[PDB]
Amino acid sequence: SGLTHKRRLSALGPGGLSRERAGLEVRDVHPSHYGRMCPIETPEGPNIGLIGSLSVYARVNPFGFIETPYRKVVDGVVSDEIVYLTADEEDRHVVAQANSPIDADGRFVEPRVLVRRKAGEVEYVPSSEVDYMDVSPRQMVSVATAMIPFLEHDDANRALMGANMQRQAVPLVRSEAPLVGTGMELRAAIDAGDVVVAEESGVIEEVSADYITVMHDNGTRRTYRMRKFARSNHGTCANQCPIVDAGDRVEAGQVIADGPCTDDGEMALGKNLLVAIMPWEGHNYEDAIILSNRLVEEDVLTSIHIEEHEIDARDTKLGAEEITRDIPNISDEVLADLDERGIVRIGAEVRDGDILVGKVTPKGREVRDTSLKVPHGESGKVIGIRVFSREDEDELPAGVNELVRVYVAQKRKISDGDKLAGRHGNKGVIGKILPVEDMPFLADGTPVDIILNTHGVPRRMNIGQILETHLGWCAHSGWKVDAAKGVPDWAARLPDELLEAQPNAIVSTPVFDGAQEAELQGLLSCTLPNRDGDVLVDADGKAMLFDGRSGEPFPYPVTVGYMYIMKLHHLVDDKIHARSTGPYSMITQQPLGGKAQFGGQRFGEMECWAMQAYGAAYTLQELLTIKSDDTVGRVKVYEAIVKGENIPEPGIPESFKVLLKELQSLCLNVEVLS
């Protein structure tokens, strides 16, 4: 997410367009954007088309015009010596497609090649007219869009969804790299800078959880320090782990430690799960998802989050305020977790409502306890406290003395209502978490991990997920092409080291140049048995499952395999809120808005229209009078309900009297006539 942020191109700013007054001609994909701005990765709401992303090979020239590399072709030969062009320059040449047939002899194998003629007009053209060539078939997309395998099999909308969703995944407690990645994951991780790279070559001397020490080749020692359990701008957890031993020799530029979402120096935003593609009892209905209970017991999709509570003691007109255990009216029992200074003990357990920093301010004794409390719905463990004291000549703001700060961290397991997604725009919330006993299990007794409904795929034109599932099964199972008597014709153009693989092999399919369908069929045709000479998945890629709830086998085979699932930052613990009474606004005496000051849900104008169309006058009247801004009515209704009385009658709202006063202030004699 940060790397994508650093490479953004925005049109709205002090000197640019406007988010509303901008038309539909500036939110378009222009032919000149080929290779300079990614056409897929844009926001989805009002900023659609106004914020873009720079491409991968593109650069900016001194005057501010973006350039993109091209490979000069001379006399019909695709030569070396890349030359950087601009849109203005590129408009007076003919450039060819990167994924084009060449035979290492500077002469196209096929007669005709699609080329952007002048105004981005793709055309079949004679082979002698080409003047330039794209560097790779991965040149128009950005960094995040280049990490979607089988991108060319997905429609633009779902590809945009997946590219945007890849930037919302939370770092899991333990990271694991995909099995079916693309390749743009090692450089993406190294350039992002969240990994630790050895400054200079040498031999590891002492490696610990907190520090690496490389003994350089000149007698110098440089100790790297790892940042453990730090907090990001968005509450996630940043944690570095060394991945080298005490005797290994490292080289300059080698990855010496891992980061939040990295595994061996490659991005790892999700986990590999065994999936089934059948409908099941209506629980995965309308984009809902079904998970096994193994992913909770074994902590497969668990994450750590950190909060930041800060409070300071001002000078105050009253004069002076102190933080200490001396909180009046409270027994020592409640202050058990508090210490001599006033802050809580590191390693303590805090629940919703608990003194974290006990203080008192004399509001004029006048001492008034305004101690920090754990927000509603918060809990965890206090893992760190930072206190800046004016007595220690700290760089504090003006008019303060102490700036004590606290950290509480808690591990969150996957629950019902959390959002998951793949890399192909397949999103959904968790409808149910079944016990691992009543789950469809293969003939050998292995349950599936996740179930995805069939009705969502063919409609949304994101078939890439099925191909990913097939190839993930092939990679996990391991395979061996039987070239006993010549390599099979479907493996003729398959590189060696790919004719055979061992279980849990990691492969890569570049974004626009990867595995063909014939290769997928061939690999599905030859996979290794599990423990016994049994192949659980046949050539079609479909297995024969058993009903764990009844025991009978399902009548037909089901598609099974391994796909890569990510856990988005849209957890249900953050989206649940309720209220009966609490803080109110001051001018228009209505409840406040927001989950963070209790606050109430707003009954808008279209809801009023609906209630009026139902012909329900009394519910509407109570909603608009006694639940919102009838000051006496609220207290009387509460006192009536707590007792067994009947609800009183509503009065006059409080937003009408304000309007009357404003109209009078505009020099208008407004009166109510009986």
Binding site: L3, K6, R7, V56, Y57, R59, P69, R71, D80, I82, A98, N99, V135, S136, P137, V143, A177, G181, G183, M184, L186, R187, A188, I190, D191, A192, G193, V250, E251, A252, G253, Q254, V255, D264, G265, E266, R493, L494, P495, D496, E497, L498, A501, A505, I506, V507, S508, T509, P510, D513, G514, A515, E519
Partner: peptide, 30 residues
């Protein structure tokens, strides 16, 4: 067949690619 042969300590992730890349991806923060 492998993906990243330039980075010294890289995992051996094998690739299905058929086309050679003349140029290396530039620095992404340049």
């Amino acid at each position: 067949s492998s993906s990243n042969n330039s980075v010294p300590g890289a995992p051996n992730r094998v690739s299905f690619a058929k086309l050679r890349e003349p140029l290396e991806v530039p620095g992404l923060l340049d």
